Write a protein that binds this DNA or RNA. Structure first.
Ligand SMILES: [Mg+2]
Length: 293
DNA sequence: TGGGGTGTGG
């Protein structure tokens, strides 16, 4: 599941991402490599990258009119299938938090192909920040990664701007939106490959091949989703659910990691699910094959 | 800026 969003403010939203299973926001992309950036994201260097102030001698901003300036960039959030989320946090399977991360690196890398600048020329490089979270605003397991793309790419010499000027030809983000499904798709496919290799089973449960591990009590950890549909309902348009997603949206919360982890384990019991039996069933499934043909 | 739900995203 890949969702999109425009970043419209540096300093402010620059923090947002700078802020419960062990807590890794790492850089990514050929562009982030050029500027010499690796698996760490300084609150300041990032907050800067959004204004147009690269680490390199590039200051592509527009600090005019008090505080009217550049265009920060975009947020491509890949959300993992609820069963994957649960198994990692409630099932303690750390191998999953990994698979998910590899699945994102794969996707985010296919997005970099569309990296192009205005003059339209595929510049094949991006400077990105990838933040990982594991809850929903409803406080449930909801592991996802905000692949924040900085509004900058590198053409021939200096850095330009992915974002466009005026209409001309569809620039970067235009194609991203035009290609959402494919991206959420191949992210989901990568996670899939690994997850099954670990010995887990999966079945389709939604459009464009969305899936989950069969048997895992998903319905019980989809509080946001349900609150959104109890409001605007089912059969509601995507746009209508966008607004619902925002109204009924609780505000960002300070949870007591162990009070919450316990509520989950507790609520997890009432479903009648045997977490342990599942991981083992998966192991035996994986073991059973790698030891045959 | 278009579009799948696990619903994130000043
Ligand atoms: Mg988040």
């Amino acid at each position: 599941m890949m969702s999109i969003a425009q970043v419209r403010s540096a300093g402010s939203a620059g923090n947002f991402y700078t802020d419960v299973l062990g807590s890794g926001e790492r850089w990514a992309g050929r562009g982030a490599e050029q500027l010499g950036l690796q698996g760490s994201v300084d609150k300041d260097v990032f907050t800067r990258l959004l204004e147009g102030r690269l680490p390199d001698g590039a200051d592509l901003s527009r600090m005019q009119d008090g505080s009217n300036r550049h265009r920060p960039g975009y947020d491509l959030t890949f959300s993992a299938p609820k069963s994957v989320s649960m198994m990692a946090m409630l099932g303690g399977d750390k191998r999953l938090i990994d698979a998910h991360n590899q699945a994102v690196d794969f996707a985010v890398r296919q997005v970099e192909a569309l990296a192009s600048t205005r003059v339209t020329v595929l510049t094949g490089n991006l400077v990105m920040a990838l933040f990982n979270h594991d809850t929903s605003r409803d406080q449930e397991p909801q592991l996802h990664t905000h692949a924040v793309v900085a509004n900058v790419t590198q053409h021939n010499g200096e850095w330009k701007t992915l974002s466009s000027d005026k209409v001309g030809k569809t620039g970067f983000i235009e194609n991203v939106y035009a290609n959402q499904i494919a991206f959420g798709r191949l992210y989901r496919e990568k996670l899939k490959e690994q997850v099954e290799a670990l010995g887990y089973e999966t079945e389709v449960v939604g459009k464009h091949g969305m899936w989950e591990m069969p048997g895992v009590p998903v319905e019980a950890f989809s509080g946001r989703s349900q609150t959104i549909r109890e409001a605007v309902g089912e059969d509601a348009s995507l746009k209508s659910r966008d607004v619902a997603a925002l109204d009924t949206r609780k505000s960002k919360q300070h949870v007591d990691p162990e009070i919450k982890m316990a509520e989950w384990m507790q609520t997890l019991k009432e479903t009648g699910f045997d977490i342990r039996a599942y991981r083992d069933a998966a192991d035996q499934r994986a073991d059973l094959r790698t030891l045959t043909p």
